[PDB]
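Design job #97: recover the sequence.
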């Protein structure tokens, strides 16, 4: 499904993302906007290394979820990558939380560095009531 901005902002807040490991709600919103455009069924195959990115946060199959076809992959979130394509984002959020527990934090997604870091991200949550 494709979330509307404020709809997603409120959902993420309810799921405990605001300030999780020092990451503000607006940063998560900026990441979701640039990764999938708030689309839960988004998938991107990376032909260079045989991995695929799944769902709202475009979580990679080499380290986080298992899709069975990615070489030398681990499944740190202990989830089928299929779980990251559901309309209910509960699992994708649990897994995103795992991703940032690593040293890099939110920096794990290059898209965050390119389009969110050091920028004014207030706009992603303004008027949503979060």
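Job complete. Output follows.
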């Amino acid at each position: 499904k494709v979330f509307e901005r404020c709809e997603l902002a409120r959902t993420l807040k309810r799921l405990g993302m605001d300030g999780y490991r020092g990451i503000s709600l607006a940063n998560w919103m900026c990441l979701a906007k640039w990764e999938s455009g708030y689309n839960t069924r988004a998938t991107n195959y990376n032909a260079g290394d045989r991995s695929t990115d799944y769902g709202t946060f475009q979580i990679n199959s080499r380290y986080w979820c298992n899709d069975g076809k990615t070489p030398g992959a681990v499944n740190a979130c202990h989830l089928s990558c299929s779980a990251l394509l559901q309309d209910n984002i509960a699992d994708a959020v649990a897994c995103a939380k795992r991703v940032v527990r690593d040293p890099q934090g939110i920096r794990a997604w290059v898209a965050w560095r390119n389009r969110c870091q050091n920028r004014d991200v207030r706009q992603y949550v303004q008027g949503c009531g979060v």
